[PDB]
Amino acid sequence: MADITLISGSTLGGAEYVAEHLAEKLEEAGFTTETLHGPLLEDLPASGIWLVISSTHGAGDIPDNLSPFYEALQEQKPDLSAVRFGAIGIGSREYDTFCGAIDKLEAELKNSGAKQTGETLKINILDHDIPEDPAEEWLGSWVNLLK
């Protein structure tokens, strides 16, 4: 069983790498985890502390792995007023769209009544594979709020 189910979302695998890396740090922090590839709303209960991670294909298109979640949310707009979530966008950051794919997924969670925790992370993958600002630092700020 997990207590922070991550919601991995890439076609390339970049979000799967970041999700696995984050999940390891969470396990060392003492919290149980899972790395659900592209789950749907009908496979997530209305209460929990989730962590949505999405590639951005350069144009704001969410990867087809996870993009149906945006549609499943807005089509049903259930009460989700006890979901907490985190949000990460990943992509080649020199593109015109700019870790913006994640915004749609978080917005419909927010609209359904959920709320974010921490702040939204950006992860450039064009040139480096993140250089210098670990997701580990951001995760520290997160566990400090979700406790």
Burial of 107 from C-beta contacts in 10 A (0-12 / 13-18 / 19+): middle
C-alpha radius of gyration, the chain, whole number: 14
Three-state DSSP state, 49: strand
Q: How was this structure determined?
A: NMR
Residue 11: which CATH number? 3.40.50.360
Phi-psi region of 77 (alpha: psi -120 to 50; beta: other; left: phi over 0): left
Expressed as residue numbers, the domain containing 10 is: 1-147
Cβ neighbours for 81, distance < 8 A, ≥ 6 positions apart: 46, 112, 113, 114
The number of folded domains in the chain is: 1
Torsion of CA 45, 47, 53, 59, to 10 degrees: 80
Burial environment of residue 52 by CB neighbours within 10 A (0 to 12, 13 to 18, 19 or more): buried
**36 token code pair:** 């659900």
